């Protein structure tokens, strides 16, 4: 039922990997009204505070939700290192 350690470690590793490009990530988490699934919102912006993009993920399982967040962060890093 509880989040697995490896998923949290991978999420932190992705966060640090994208932080190595002088970036930052904000994290928000809550529970939705009627969809009966937890929601996590991520925002990516640079140090000066210029927001680049945001995303929101909804799921009733912690493991799947964290994996989706981690792979979205990895895709963001990949796209941001394709150029710039």
């Amino acid at each position: 039922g509880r989040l697995y350690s490896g998923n949290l470690a991978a999420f932190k590793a992705a966060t640090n990997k994208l932080f190595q490009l002088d970036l930052a990530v904000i994290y928000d988490d809550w529970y939705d009204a009627y969809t009966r699934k937890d929601c996590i919102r991520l925002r990516i912006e640079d140090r000066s505070g210029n927001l680049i993009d945001t995303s929101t993920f909804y799921h009733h399982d912690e493991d799947v939700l964290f994996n989706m967040c981690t792979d979205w962060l990895n895709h963001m890093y990949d796209q941001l290192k394709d150029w710039k």
């Binding site: 989040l3 949290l8 999420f11 932190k12 904000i26 994290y27 988490d29 912690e62």
Partner: protein, 476 residues
């Protein structure tokens, strides 16, 4: 012009009593303060802190003897002024009641801010922070061994705050913690005159440099922290005190502590069979070089009959001298610029007799010395356990204090719930006032987090800290 009506302030900070009051209702204000202080959790905790030996005296029993000596110095001063018909001229005609009560409550709560294990518990907190903040590297233009990015010198308007915060955090003093505990944590809401009686020194904790020669004695130790700067200014405005000045009644409390410094420890040594009464008498005779004070008590007894008269004999010779010294230098004490203490004569030389015997035969015992080394190790270990709390970021700590159920920091969140609720409430109130959209928020937040960490450690009994240290290391 000496006028004690401008010094004895019966107003409060919150829900202050306004309007004109008679002599009877003024006295009722100073009795509720006594009820608040005596029935406070801070005073109850004094019976679980050791003086020297872990029938031995604790800090609660020690502060009860200092309270009795203070009463007696105030009564001698009040009675001597009535003989000179100066009570009405000095404004003390209708204030003889609170005059003794303030001294008695200042003597009682003169050790409420001491950390566990005492002196060596105070040093351990200072060294551990000194390695993380390196205050000596912020004295001049940017050089930097600081372990915090936000407090590293890089920005002239922001470097002064950085060096002030770095210097203050490495200066922990029990007297400075007493003011913070009485106002911010316990929220006792005492009168202005009562708070001024526990302000022993006037040097700010963030002070770096040389002190003025006119106040080299009153500023020998830190007196208050930076988080209380606004509160101390209001207190000075309320009590009509200049910068770096002292309250007149603080001198009486200082003299009472100096009288009851080593005499109790000598009696406690006999009860632990370190030596016998005859051996102690021989040691005192050898160290002295006495007849009116010690010899009178020796021939009037045998253990509970030697000190019972020695205390009386030394009081009857020391109290009048203190009263005369207080009365003679009255304008300077009232102004708050007296750069000396009440106690170079046969009176001051007598205290050194008890001072020298105690340091050579009691303070050097192997059992006393061992506890001092064990206490230093316990406090250092506790600060290392909570070190992950200081390594987090502003957003992570804000999420921890707001959500209280964090899935990203399992270890850090569990350590956070061990802190007392009053300290957390104080932290929330302190950070709930700073301008969020300012370039000074991280510095103040880190300072308040460090203060919150320091409050939790210093508010423990010696016995509780040892148990927590052993349990958190998976030993017990």
């Amino acid at each position: 012009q000496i006028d004690f009506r401008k010094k004895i302030n019966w107003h409060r900070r919150y829900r202050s009593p306004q309007g004109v009051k008679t002599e009877h209702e003024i006295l009722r204000i100073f009795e509720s303060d006594r009820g608040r202080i005596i029935n406070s959790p801070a005073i109850r905790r004094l019976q679980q802190k050791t003086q020297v030996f872990p029938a031995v005296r604790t800090r609660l029993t020690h502060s009860m003897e200092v309270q009795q000596v203070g009463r007696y110095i105030a009564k001698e001063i009040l009675s001597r002024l009535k003989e000179l018909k100066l009570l009405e001229a000095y404004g003390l005609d209708e204030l003889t009641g609170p005059f003794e009560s303030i001294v008695e409550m200042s003597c009682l709560m003169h050790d409420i801010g001491n950390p566990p294990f005492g002196h060596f518990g105070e040093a351990a907190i200072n060294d551990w922070f000194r390695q993380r903040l390196h205050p000596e590297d912020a004295e001049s233009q940017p050089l930097d061994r600081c372990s915090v990015a936000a407090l590293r010198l890089r920005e002239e308007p922001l470097n002064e705050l950085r060096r002030k915060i770095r210097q203050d955090l490495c200066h922990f003093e029990g007297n400075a913690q007493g003011i913070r505990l009485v106002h911010t944590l316990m929220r006792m809401n005492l009168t202005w005159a009562q708070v001024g009686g526990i302000l022993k020194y006037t040097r700010p904790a963030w002070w770096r440099g040389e002190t003025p020669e006119t106040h080299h004695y009153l500023m020998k130790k830190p007196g208050y922290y930076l988080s209380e700067e606004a509160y101390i200014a209001r207190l000075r405005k309320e009590l009509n005190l200049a910068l770096y000045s002292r309250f007149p009644l603080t001198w009486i409390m200082e003299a009472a502590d100096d009288i009851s410094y080593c005499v109790a420890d000598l009696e406690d040594a006999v009860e632990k069979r370190i030596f016998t009464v005859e051996q102690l008498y021989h040691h005192l005779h050898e160290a002295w070089g006495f007849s009116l004070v010690v010899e009178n008590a020796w021939e009037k007894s045998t253990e509970d009959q030697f000190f019972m008269y020695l205390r009386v004999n030394t009081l009857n010779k020391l109290v009048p001298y203190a009263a005369q010294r207080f009365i003679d230098n009255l304008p300077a004490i009232f102004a708050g610029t007296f750069n000396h203490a009440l106690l170079a004569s046969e009176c001051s030389d007598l205290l050194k007799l008890y001072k020298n015997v105690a340091v050579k035969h009691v303070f050097s015992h192997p059992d006393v010395e061992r506890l001092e080394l064990q206490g230093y190790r316990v406090i250092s270990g506790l600060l290392e356990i909570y070190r992950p709390l200081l390594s987090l970021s502003l957003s992570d700590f804000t999420e921890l204090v707001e959500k209280e159920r964090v899935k990203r920091f399992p270890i850090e969140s569990r350590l956070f719930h061990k802190l007392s609720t009053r300290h957390r409430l104080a932290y929330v109130e302190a950070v709930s006032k700073l301008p969020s959209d300012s370039p000074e928020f991280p510095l103040w937040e880190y300072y308040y987090r460090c203060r919150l960490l320091q409050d939790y450690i210093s508010g423990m009994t010696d016995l509780y800290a040892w148990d927590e240290y052993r349990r958190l290391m998976a030993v017990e």
